[PDB]
Ligand binder design. Structure first.
Ligand SMILES: Nc1nc2c(ncn2[C@@H]2O[C@H](COP(=O)(O)OP(=O)(O)OP(=O)(O)O)[C@@H](O)[C@H]2O)c(=O)[nH]1
Ligand SMILES: [Mg+2]
Ligand code: NA
Length: 422
């Protein structure tokens, strides 16, 4: 017993992403998400289901909480996807009134539900829990504010356990005009209390789906969020299936976080289709992961990699994984202080993702984060310098001084990344 993880889904986006994540986890473990049972004994594989799944005498359940300040996103999701016996009511923490896209309302209002959330965690979490994953968007009010509150709360209440965030940044044109405030307040909070923040944005996700999967249309967020679920599943695969070289959450964080502030990570995965997994080399897949076309954050270029984690899944030639390392270091730009022999952390798992031959997942700590964050800062300043949209932050406990304090700390993080870039 040990290595267990609890996943908290917060707000509309965080819970919708949760559907794709848990669908992927059940499929990888050959669990029927509708019956809660193994699909069969014969195809039960040697694995460690307890990382994300609770086995009870009646069947399997997600080690998850489904948290929102309004009920519709979760209720509609559970009905449409027929999740009623897996996303069960005892795992939901729902209110009625919404955060109205204001971080401060999400933070304040969420405080009222913290006792129930802690009781549920303390009621069912094994003592050996290794950590928490918080799934949320940063541009709305509940994912951002309540997610921030939860990051702070768990790090304070459970010292010694990992707190990792999977966080969706605003799109290149924001689809919430308040998103700069909500994103700066969230990234400030996560810089204080998270151990590692894995970032995504919808501009990059849409580009990948349209250009790598060539979907003719995206009608529901499930046809975008599957990419976030894929990253979450694959970087934990070596906790759940056999393989030559396994790694846990804080093992990956320790290899990535060069300075305490540099905890903001860009993920990528290759290939995106089964057909490509059958006609690709380890070299080709790693090169795709390091290419901006595959980054799940919208970036202007390759940037400079400070540190990276690569998970090789499936039918992997270990000699190829090792021999390409000099080629990665020669062909990918790394930050000036990175020694030629350093900057790579490998995990190798024998389990391929559903029906693929092999797959590589990259977590990159990259100086280009400074460009992504600077753009957020420029959006923030365009509102804040005019005093636009501040009233309902002020009315919910975030003074104008507090907004500025969060902005200035955010800027200090940007400058650390820019300094490392050289
Ligand atoms: N990738 C992805 N983005 C989403 C999803 N749902 C919403 N978004 C994005 O998330 C941001 C809006 O945040 P929501 O998650 O809707 O807000 P919330 O956390 O429910 O907060 P409130 O509605 O303000 O209480 C926008 O940038 C949306 O485009 C989703 O399922 N997947
Ligand atoms: Mg909402
Ligand atoms: Na909303």
């Amino acid at each position: 017993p040990g290595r267990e993880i609890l996943v908290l889904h917060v707000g509309q986006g965080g819970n919708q992403i949760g559907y794709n994540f848990w669908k992927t986890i059940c499929e990888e473990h050959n669990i029927d998400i509708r019956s809660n049972q193994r699909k069969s004994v014969e195809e039960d594989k040697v694995d460690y289901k307890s990382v994300f799944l609770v086995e009870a005498p009646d069947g399997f359940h997600p080690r998850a909480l489904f948290i929102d300040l309004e009920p519709l996103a979760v209720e509609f999701l559970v009905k449409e996807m027929k999740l009623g016996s897996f996303f069960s009511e005892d795992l939901m923490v729902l209110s009625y009134s919404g955060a109205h896209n204001v971080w401060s309302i999400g933070y304040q209002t969420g405080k009222k539900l913290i006792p129930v959330i802690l009781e549920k965690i303390r009621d069912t979490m094994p003592e050996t829990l290794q950590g928490f994953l918080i799934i949320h968007t940063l541009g709305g009010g509940t994912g951002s504010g309540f997610g921030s509150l939860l990051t702070e709360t768990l790090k304070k209440e459970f010292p010694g356990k990992g707190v990792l965030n999977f966080s969706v940044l605003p799109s290149e044109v924001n689809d919430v005009t308040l998103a700069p405030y909500n994103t700066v307040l969230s990234l400030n909070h996560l810089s204080r209390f998270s151990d590692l923040v894995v970032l995504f944005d919808n501009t990059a996700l849409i580009r990948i789906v349209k250009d790598q999967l060539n979907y003719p249309v995206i009608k529901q967020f499930s046809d975008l969020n599957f990419l976030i679920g894929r990253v979450m599943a694959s970087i934990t695969a070596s906790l759940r299936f056999p393989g030559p070289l396994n790694m846990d959450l804080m093992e990956m964080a320790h290899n990535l976080v060069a300075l305490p502030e540099t905890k903001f990570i860009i993920p990528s995965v290759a290939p995106l289709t089964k057909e490509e997994s059958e006609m690709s080399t380890e070299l080709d897949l790693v090169e795709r992961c390091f290419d901006p076309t595959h980054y799940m954050v919208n970036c202007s270029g390759q940037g400079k990699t400070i540190s990276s984690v690569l998970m090789f899944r499936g039918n992997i030639a270990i000699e190829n994984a090792f021999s390409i390392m000099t080629d990665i270091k020669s062909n990918v730009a790394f930050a000036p202080g990175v020694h030629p022999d350093l900057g790579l952390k490998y995990g190798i798992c024998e389990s391929a993702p559903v029906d693929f031959d092999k797959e590589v997942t990259l977590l990159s700590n990259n100086t280009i984060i400074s460009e992504v964050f600077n753009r957020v800062l420029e959006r923030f300043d365009s509102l804040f310098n005019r005093d636009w949209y501040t009233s309902d932050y002020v009315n919910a406990g975030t003074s104008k001084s507090n907004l500025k304090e969060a902005r200035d700390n955010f800027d200090r993080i940007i400058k650390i990344y820019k300094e490392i870039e050289g």
